Amino acid sequence: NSRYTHFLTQHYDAKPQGRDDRYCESIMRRRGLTSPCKDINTFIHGNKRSIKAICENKNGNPHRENLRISKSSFPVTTCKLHGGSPWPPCQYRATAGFRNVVVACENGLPVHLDQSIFRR
């Protein structure tokens, strides 16, 4: 999947520093999500092997018929736009957690992250 590599650029960070507000503003810039400022974006941490495994029994179960929910929890960081302005420089607030994730899978690869679960 070109979709998988895209999912990775939008939602995967193997080496997060701080996972604080400073981290969010920096990563959102690095991943090209500041033109205009994405309103919310979650990054998953850890190794890619475990995220891929959500698409199979190894680390997932079916969810909402057509999605997958992880067996394991993952370190995550949700970056939420702060201050209203949709143009850079973008201000973000970080919410770090350790929780299961829901993805859509195509051909054994995650291609979409369900953002709805990180609003809460």
Residue numbers in the entry: 3 to 122
The authors write:
Angiogenin (ANG), a 14-kDa basic protein is an angiogenic ribonuclease and member of the bovine pancreatic ribonuclease (RNase A) family (also known as RNase 5).
The residue Q77 forms part of the β4 strand in the ANG wild-type structure.
